[PDB]
Amino acid sequence: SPLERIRLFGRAGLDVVAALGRSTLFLGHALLGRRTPGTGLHLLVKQLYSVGVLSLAIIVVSGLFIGMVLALQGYNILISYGSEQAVGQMVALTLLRELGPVVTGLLFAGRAGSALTAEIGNMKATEQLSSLEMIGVDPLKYIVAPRLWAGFISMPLLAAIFSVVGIWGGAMVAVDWLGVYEGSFWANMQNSVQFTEDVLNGVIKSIVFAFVVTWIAVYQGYDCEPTSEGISRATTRTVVYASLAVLGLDFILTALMF
Amino acid sequence: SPLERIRLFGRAGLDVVAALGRSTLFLGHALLGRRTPGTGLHLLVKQLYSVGVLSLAIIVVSGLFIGMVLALQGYNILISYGSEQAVGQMVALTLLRELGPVVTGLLFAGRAGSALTAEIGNMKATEQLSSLEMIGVDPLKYIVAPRLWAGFISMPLLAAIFSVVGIWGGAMVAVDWLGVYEGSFWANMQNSVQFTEDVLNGVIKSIVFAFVVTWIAVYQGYDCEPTSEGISRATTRTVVYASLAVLGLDFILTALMF
Amino acid sequence: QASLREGAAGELQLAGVLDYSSGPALREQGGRLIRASQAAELVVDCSAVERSSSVGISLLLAFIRDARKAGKVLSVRALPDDMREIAKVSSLLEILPL
Amino acid sequence: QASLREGAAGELQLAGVLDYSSGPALREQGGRLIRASQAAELVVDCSAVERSSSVGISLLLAFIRDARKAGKVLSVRALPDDMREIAKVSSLLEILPL
Amino acid sequence: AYAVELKGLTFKRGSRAIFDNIDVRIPRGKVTGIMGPSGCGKTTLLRLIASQLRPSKGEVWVNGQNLPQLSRGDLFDMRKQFGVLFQSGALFTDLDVFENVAFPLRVHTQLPEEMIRDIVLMKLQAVGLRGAVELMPDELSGGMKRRVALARAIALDPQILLYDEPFVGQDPIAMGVLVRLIRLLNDALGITSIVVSHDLAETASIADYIYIVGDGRVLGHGTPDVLKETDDPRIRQFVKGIPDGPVPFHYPARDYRADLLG
Amino acid sequence: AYAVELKGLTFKRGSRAIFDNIDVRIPRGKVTGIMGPSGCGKTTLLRLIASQLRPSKGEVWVNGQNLPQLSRGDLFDMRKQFGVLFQSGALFTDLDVFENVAFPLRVHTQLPEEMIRDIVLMKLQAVGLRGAVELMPDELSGGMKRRVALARAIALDPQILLYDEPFVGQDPIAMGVLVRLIRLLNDALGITSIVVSHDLAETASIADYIYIVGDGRVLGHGTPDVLKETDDPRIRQFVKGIPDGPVPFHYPARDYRADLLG
Ligand SMILES: CCCCCCCCCCCCCCCC(=O)OC[C@H](COP(=O)(O)O)OC(=O)CCCCCCCCCCCCCCC
Ligand SMILES: CCCCCCCCCCCCCCCC(=O)OC[C@H](COP(=O)(O)O)OC(=O)CCCCCCCCCCCCCCC
Ligand SMILES: CCCCCCCCCCCCCCCC(=O)OC[C@H](COP(=O)(O)O)OC(=O)CCCCCCCCCCCCCCC
Ligand SMILES: CCCCCCCCCCCCCCCC(=O)OC[C@H](COP(=O)(O)O)OC(=O)CCCCCCCCCCCCCCC
Ligand SMILES: CCCCCCCCCCCCCCCC(=O)OC[C@H](COP(=O)(O)O)OC(=O)CCCCCCCCCCCCCCC
Ligand SMILES: CCCCCCCCCCCCCCCC(=O)OC[C@H](COP(=O)(O)O)OC(=O)CCCCCCCCCCCCCCC
Ligand SMILES: Nc1ncnc2c1ncn2[C@@H]1O[C@H](COP(=O)(O)OP(=O)(O)NP(=O)(O)O)[C@@H](O)[C@H]1O
Ligand SMILES: Nc1ncnc2c1ncn2[C@@H]1O[C@H](COP(=O)(O)OP(=O)(O)NP(=O)(O)O)[C@@H](O)[C@H]1O
């Protein structure tokens, strides 16, 4: 029925409505609820390991490849303009103000934005997440608070590591394989950086959709209905949305500052 | 034990070894095994819907955002060079030869590279994938062959749609919000395209790691051990690898052709 | 396999083995090839039936849709044993008039 | 709660309620605060025990590790009823010498 | 006199009215096993009487006070009274077996890290999983993966404890050891235990005052005997095989004649 | 004389030696129920005697010929003989109930799309899920989600059929209707049925010649009676509660004295 079809559409409207409402409530309860008995900092260490460190080889190799691609594209894009040696101010400006954090999102939100949702989803599905209450610990502070903290304090560091490896790979292909001159590269690069105005720009950009990624990437895991199909669908909702939001907030955050 | 630690490391070596070996065998059996009784083409239609169409809104919105970001970055990157009106030959060359298909991979491999693995994973886990044999149909031709075909014939179309919407959004922000002149944009764009040499380049680039994405994105789903934790880990392995391979083959495919 | 015969005057004879193989041919050669020509009062009697599965049940069933659609009335005689049981399971208690 | 007393001459008196609350204090005030000073042959007897859970079981247990580490030998007397059962479950059949 | 009583309790999940003005009254010291049809809301009743789920209205008297009307600082202290054993164990995949069993102690009590080890050890011996004090539950075979959970429950020596479908889907050796333990804990430790199992046979075997929960209303209750011949059509259909009765066998079809004919 | 026999069968999953030179011989017309301890390899035996899993060496005589030595064009034709009912239904989430049940017909037979509908309808009536001929299994309550699978199995009228843990984890009403159907199919349709259930009680209740599979070797077999007093320690430990016996209760710990003391 078309009228009831639109009824279902509107029900989905109110559904995402109440969804992110409940999400912000969840986030509040998690970051500022109380202090639980069985918490600490070792939790944060274990998480930060599972979320950042394990997801580090991926972004290292990905930074390598995307950097040398950025080079092999800039060299050939610009040799048609003579200003070949200026490739440094490209491979280090695009890889540092916009593409750096965007790809770092789409990868972090790819792996650690998912195997983080499936983790606390599975937890909810084997009731493990529930027996915590019957014990007495608040899960939203023992199970998910270290997730959020491993998010906020990993993805920015990951973006930095990615940008570094990207620039270095771009140089290594440009210097050794393209043949452009050694010192000229870093020279034009440092002459065209504007630290507080591009580097810090990219870092605040990284942090904001670090927060946004590992916010949904954990909420979805907390909300998914407990069944092996439910989790299998939540760990896809949290890639759809974690990429949508990465790019959307990249766009807004770059309209705030060109 | 360190010696046994290296033993485990080497066991993982042989493991990924035999893994992708078995993967290529699987792919062969799937695409060229036999012709099954209960197959057809309606299967391909249903799949192609579930894989392409549902994953179309994501890449539409993502193309929009990434295009207007590419613009808002090019305008400001290049106004410092005077050649402002040349933004068209940027927002339409980067979004069409390298970044277009790469982001289309990281998104398709994000959503339809996962909710495709979880699907045929869940199938294997509720034994649904197994009763097909006890009936007699070969699953590798009824369950996964339409997956592969919905992969190969969707991701390239998706890359094209993405590049189109990206260029159009870049124009819409450049024309209406940046104020650069209407005809000049498309003019410098078409004067600097080299169809058979950039457009077709981007399309073959899209196709190759369409094949590569929806190859692992279905193999992993076929191999994952049947348990709600197994699938929850496979649908992360098939984002790690589906992004690794996207970028790696992008790099190789752009070293084949600058 | 099995077969069909003896039309236009009731007394629909049914042969031995009604399986998934011999199914459709008998359906089509009976439903229109015979039930278009009948007079009335179709006695379908399963005398010389060897062995039949639910496919035969659904066959004598389709034998009834057309006859009802053909206006004329029909009934079954000499219902075999295995058929009797396959009807016993999925009730078909009276829907098989004898 | 409960308490500890009567050291240096065996006859370790134990008071009423040994719970998770009154646990650690009794452990520390017995293990070193008392077992460093004892002569030998430590008779720990649970006469005036009101009510105790497994925490008390593990307490009289720790009462044995130190004594064994302190060389001197010890034993229990007048084992209460609930303790008797909490030992009965997790065997502790002979590991509680009486 | 009673360990747990549920006065005027009702619950609605999205106004679905899961529970509807119910009254259950558990006797202490006696293993009572509640159960009911599919989707009848048992586990909901568990998380209720364990105060994980906030009731809509009513009160849950538990060894004295009622829970939904307690202060967090006091509710947490009450948590020391009741243990819960889910099916599928519900172990923390992060921590090994030993730390997993110790967890409730490391939460509600401040003991010398040796003494915690001794309590954990004696409990694990009581349940038998004393050897695997190092395994991670990922490494642990699905059977004992439940007995370790039971040991974690009986830690702190709670006076009552809940069982969410304990004997469901395991070889009768594991089912046998588990049904021996859940009864040993009650015969010895004198702790109220609330089995919650779809399995009628073993439940009615061991239980003392079984209930039957259906569509938001207790569908009667009794000791196994009175329940075996209640003659209430709903119940007597449940507690026996008798597939056709108040709960229909067939789905609400239209007609076995018309639909197949027209 | 026998429906299915397994001569000299052995199987190894990664050289683990799942099955090890076994000999099982199923009589036709009689519901036999095989079972065994946890991880004992039953479902493996299913997929073997249903020819989804290629045996290492041995032969599986099935109503005549043996399968692993048949041509694909003939193996497919043999597939028409044996049906399989998994637990959790194993329905195709893609297709609705009706198409789901029709699937085997739409595969092995070319029938007028009406006639397929009539066979599907009579089967669904036989199992009772005749009404929900439109629901998608996603919409279907987990109980009937199995009876529809059973109807799909009995489609084509296979002469033997397998049951992978049928009566495991459902309210005794659904378990009752299912145990009535799995027996009605055998008493009427005279089709060999192979229950495979950890649940000892109902299995031994309905079964005729039960087996016991353990660590790659059949641990004996018999009708329920002889099996109830075999006095073989392993078996008599299995078929009764008796938790402590050949299968140990405790884990291989070191010492209940030293470890807790030293
Ligand atoms: C009058 C107020 C009362 C209610 C108003 C709520 C409407 C606002 C929310 C819109 C979301 C509707 C989508 C529902 C469709 C659906 O099927 O749902 C689509 C999905 C969920 O679909 P499923 O539940 O079927 O999986 O939801 C989403 O896509 C959520 C992302 C939407 C964006 C959220 C933030 C909005 C950003 C700002 C808007 C940009 C517009 C630009 C204007 C300048
Ligand atoms: C001629 C030289 C060309 C050599 C080609 C090899 C390059 C391709 C290597 C593949 C990348 C591996 C990452 C896969 C993700 C993963 O492992 O996934 C991450 C896993 C996850 O571990 P878990 O098992 O605990 O989940 O971590 C690992 O165990 C892997 C550790 C090392 C893997 C290699 C990564 C660093 C080495 C990269 C080499 C780059 C060379 C630099 C060029 C100058
Ligand atoms: C993924 C692919 C990467 C993109 C590469 C494709 C081709 C490059 C872009 C086309 C523009 C160059 C044509 C003009 C010729 C010219 O005179 O260009 C060369 C001129 C010559 O002046 P100089 O000698 O002083 O450098 O210099 C410049 O234009 C400065 C810009 C260099 C690039 C620096 C990085 C800013 C670019 C945007 C960053 C983020 C965008 C990337 C993702 C959206
Ligand atoms: C050209 C104009 C562009 C238009 C701009 C509009 C889009 C803006 C960006 C889109 C955001 C993506 C929406 C994803 C949410 C969703 O899909 O909503 C859907 C999901 C849940 O929906 P379901 O559970 O029903 O599927 O939402 C969530 O998971 C809950 C949290 C949503 C995250 C919101 C992020 C807000 C960003 C705040 C940044 C400020 C913080 C900085 C502090 C330091
Ligand atoms: C101003 C009010 C508008 C608010 C935003 C409207 C949200 C409407 C979302 C519906 C979109 C299609 C959903 C189809 C459902 C489906 O099949 O697919 C739904 C998909 C996922 O499919 P599933 O149902 O299988 O989960 O969900 C989505 O991802 C939808 C993403 C919506 C994102 C909206 C962001 C706003 C766009 C910003 C553009 C800025 C331009 C402005 C320039 C001036
Ligand atoms: C015109 C040219 C034609 C090109 C032909 C395309 C060939 C594509 C072959 C790619 C293989 C895909 C793997 C399939 C998925 C799978 O099953 O593979 C899955 C297995 C893992 O199995 P398990 O994790 O389950 O054990 O292996 C992998 O994870 C593969 C990882 C893919 C990484 C790609 C990296 C390539 C780039 C390397 C370059 C090094 C650069 C160094 C220079 C300094
Ligand atoms: N969070 C929830 N949101 C919506 N529905 C729920 C939720 N939790 C439970 N339900 C439904 O409400 C009922 C409660 O589930 P459950 O506790 O398993 O029922 P039960 O009768 O106690 N045990 P069972 O018969 O196995 O379902 C079921 O019908 C669930 O589908
Ligand atoms: N593909 C596989 N790869 C590796 N191990 C497997 C595989 N399939 C099964 N196994 C293992 O081999 C055994 C076979 O599983 P299963 O068929 O369930 O055993 P079963 O004795 O027949 N039934 P159950 O006791 O419930 O496990 C189990 O121990 C599994 O862990």
UniProtKB/TrEMBL annotation, chains A, B:
One of its GO terms (molecular function) is phospholipid transporter activity. It is found in: Cell inner membrane. The keyword Cell inner membrane applies. Keywords: Cell inner membrane, Cell membrane, Membrane, Transmembrane, Transmembrane helix, Transport. InterPro entries: ABC_MlaE_roteobac, MlaE_Permease, Permease_MalE. It is a multi-pass membrane protein. It holds the Pfam family MlaE. The chain crosses the membrane at residues 8-28, 48-72, 157-179, 199-218, 239-258. GO terms for cellular component: ATP-binding cassette (ABC) transporter complex; plasma membrane. GO terms for biological process: phospholipid transport; response to nitrite. It comes from the Bacteria. Belongs to the MlaE permease family. Part of the ABC transporter complex MlaFEDB, which is involved in a phospholipid transport pathway that maintains lipid asymmetry in the outer membrane by retrograde trafficking of phospholipids from the outer membrane to the inner membrane. Probably responsible for the translocation of the substrate across the membrane. The complex is composed of two ATP-binding proteins (MlaF), two transmembrane proteins (MlaE), two cytoplasmic solute-binding proteins (MlaB) and six periplasmic solute-binding proteins (MlaD). This is Intermembrane phospholipid transport system permease protein MlaE. It comes from Pseudomonas aeruginosa (strain ATCC 15692 / DSM 22644 / CIP 104116 / JCM 14847 / LMG 12228 / 1C / PRS 101 / PAO1).
TrEMBL record, chains C, D:
This is STAS domain-containing protein. It holds the Pfam family STAS_2. Residues 12-98 form the STAS domain. PROSITE patterns: STAS. CDD domains: STAS_anti-anti-sigma_factors. It comes from Pseudomonas aeruginosa (strain ATCC 15692 / DSM 22644 / CIP 104116 / JCM 14847 / LMG 12228 / 1C / PRS 101 / PAO1).
UniProtKB/TrEMBL annotation, chains E, F:
GO terms for molecular function: ATP binding; ATP hydrolysis activity. Residues 4-240 form the ABC transporter domain. InterPro entries: AAA+_ATPase, ABC_transporter-like_ATP-bd, ABC_transporter-like_CS, P-loop_NTPase. Gene3D superfamilies: P-loop containing nucleotide triphosphate hydrolases (3.40.50.300). Mg(2+) binds at residue 43. Belongs to the ABC transporter superfamily. MlaF family. The complex is composed of two ATP-binding proteins (MlaF), two transmembrane proteins (MlaE), two cytoplasmic solute-binding proteins (MlaB) and six periplasmic solute-binding proteins (MlaD). This is Intermembrane phospholipid transport system ATP-binding protein MlaF. It comes from Pseudomonas aeruginosa (strain ATCC 15692 / DSM 22644 / CIP 104116 / JCM 14847 / LMG 12228 / 1C / PRS 101 / PAO1).
